[PDB]
Every structure is written in structure tokens, then in C-alpha cells.
Ligand binder design. Structure first.
Ligand SMILES: Brc1cnn2c(NCc3ccncc3)cc(-c3ccccc3)nc12
Length: 290
């Protein structure tokens, strides 16, 4: 770590503080994350080769004095801040579309190598002045786990958690990331979180009130899941036209396939890239005030 000069704190991550830092040598400006079982070291080390333009580059892993530091490529803004900033007018549809398209490419890449994110959320979607958006923290969950609270005691958000995780499926799939991204897509369009649960049951019930309480018809095997209870209330499903106005039919159709209950039926990232919603996709430049 003596090779880096911290510039400022840029975030409170799941596993530790995240700093903007300068490589005291090359002058490189980076993001430095403070986070060791050998399995974690091997898993993380593998992420160094998982490179794609829509994944924040993992530059190096530093293990010293039994402390772990991850050095990443630096980006100037995150999607949470960008969305807050664009609240008054909303993010233009062509930009939301470009972002979704790019994020789907990042997921398709990671998923092809059998790597899951498992904790996608606006805070870990990073943007630059060129119109790019990238996923940060891919693979860390499998390496370190996903805590209930952060090292700061901050509550880890449930808002984007897939229903199979909430229902106790132990061996969830790449579909969990498609669910999260669908939640984020709806939030960009409406300017409000889709399912802002504040406990596991609130999160589940918020999903059920919008998408209908799942049953054996829409999700074969659901009633057997570890945390499923026959006493869950039976709510009816709402129309997407009410949920994400005024998203067009193509967008509502895609969102519906990203939020399918049955993870087996949920659209894959690769199939989503082929959806008609992306027929007119472009890459606009966002207006960034740094
Ligand atoms: Br890797 C990583 C690379 N950049 N980066 C950024 N950049 C955005 C930013 C935010 C504030 N000041 C300057 C740049 C934020 C976070 C982050 C980590 C945890 C929580 C929130 C954001 N992680 C990262």
C-alpha cells in the first residue's frame, strides 16, 4: 500500500472503505478498496482475467499483513448519484436504453464464464463522460459472501434481490443478476425504486403485490422452496402499464421477461440483447458535472 496516495473517500463499500488514490509511481488514478482465507485469494485472483469494457477493471490484488486491497480502474460517477441528479427531468429514454444494453453485454460476458455478481445495485454501476457504464464488484460475493450489514453497519439493500434468494434457494443462478438489472431498469424509467423493501418479508411482499403471489402455475416448485409459507397472502398481478409508465411496449415486454418468477424462464442476458427493444439503440453522451 505504500505505493498509493489516498486522495479522498469515494464510497463506503460492502466490505470496506473505497478510496480514490494515486499510484505514487505511475501517477495512475485508481479506486482502492480495503476488504485471508486462501479460497478467497484464489477466487479474487481469477477475476483479474475477467475483462470486458462494461466491467470495471480489477488492476491488482494486494495481500499484506493479512490485509486485502483491491485496486480498480477509477470512474467519476455512479448511477445512484446520476439518477439523484437527473430526478427533476429523468434520464432520457435513449440513454436508459444504452445503459441497459451495455449492462446486458457485461452480464452476458460474466455469465458466459459462470461468474455471478449477486448484488447489483445503482451504487455499483459506474459511468464516465463517454457514455459508458460499467459493473463494479462482479464476483466478490462468491469470494467474500454478502453480509446483512456493511463494515460500517449500514444495511445492505434488499431492493434488488431476486425472489429465489429471498425464498431460500441455495444454488441460485445467473438469473439473479437479470432480476436485479430489471429492477434498476424500472427505477431509471420511473425515478422511484421498484421494490424498496425494508426487511426480507417486506421485500417479498412488495414483489408479490406487484407481480402477484407466485404459485405452482407461474413457478413450478415454488411451494417447496425453503422459506415459502402456505400462509403468504395471495395478491393479484398488476399490469406493467401501471408499474412503469410511460415505458413503451417493447420496454414493458423486456422488463416482464427480466422479472419472470421462475429463474429458468427468466430471460438470459444474451437473449435480452436480441430483444426488439434494442432495435434502435444508440450511445448518447450523458451530461456529467464533475
Ligand atoms: Br471500484 C470503483 C471505481 N470508481 N468508483 C466510484 N466512482 C464514483 C465516485 C464517487 C464519488 N467520488 C468520486 C467518484 C465509486 C465507487 C463506490 C463504492 C462504494 C460506494 C459508492 C461508490 N466505487 C468505484
Amino acid at each position: 500500500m505504500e505505493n498509493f496516495q489516498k486522495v479522498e473517500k469515494i464510497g463506503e463499500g460492502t466490505y470496506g472503505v473505497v478510496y480514490k488514490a494515486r499510484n505514487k509511481l505511475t501517477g495512475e488514478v485508481v479506486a482502492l478498496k480495503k476488504i485471508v482465507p486462501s479460497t478467497a485469494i484464489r477466487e479474487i485472483s481469477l477475476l483479474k482475467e475477467l475483462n470486458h469494457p462494461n466491467i470495471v477493471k480489477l488492476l491488482d490484488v494486494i495481500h499484506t499483513e493479512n490485509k486485502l486491497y483491491l485496486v480498480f480502474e477509477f470512474l467519476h460517477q455512479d448511477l445512484k448519484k446520476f439518477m439523484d441528479a437527473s430526478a427533476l427531468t429523468g434520464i432520457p429514454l435513449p440513454l436508459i436504453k444504452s445503459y441497459l444494453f451495455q449492462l446486458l453485454q457485461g452480464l452476458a460476458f460474466c455469465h458466459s464464464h459462470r461468474v455471478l455478481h449477486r448484488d447489483l445495485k445503482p451504487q455499483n454501476l459506474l459511468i464516465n463522460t463517454e457514455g459508458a457504464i460499467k459493473l463494479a464488484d462482479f464476483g466478490l460475493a462468491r469470494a467474500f459472501g454478502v453480509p446483512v450489514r456493511t463494515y460500517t453497519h449500514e444495511v445492505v439493500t434488499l431492493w434488488y434481490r431476486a425472489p429465489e434468494i429471498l425464498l431460500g434457494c441455495k444454488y441460485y443462478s445467473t438469473a439473479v443478476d437479470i432480476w436485479s438489472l430489471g429492477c434498476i431498469f424500472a427505477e431509471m424509467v420511473t425515478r422511484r425504486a421498484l421494490f424498496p423493501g425494508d426487511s426480507e418479508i417486506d421485500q417479498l411482499f412488495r414483489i408479490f403485490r406487484t407481480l402477484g403471489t407466485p404459485d405452482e402455475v407461474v413457478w413450478p416448485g415454488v411451494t417447496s422452496m425453503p422459506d415459502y409459507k402456505p400462509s403468504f397472502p395471495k395478491w393479484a398481478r398488476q399490469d406493467f402499464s401501471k408499474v412503469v409508465p410511460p415505458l413503451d411496449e417493447d420496454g414493458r415486454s423486456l422488463l416482464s421477461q427480466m422479472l419472470h418468477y421462475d429463474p429458468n424462464k427468466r430471460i438470459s442476458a444474451k437473449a435480452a440483447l436480441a430483444h426488439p427493444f434494442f432495435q434502435d439503440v444508440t450511445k448518447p453522451v450523458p451530461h456529467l458535472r464533475l
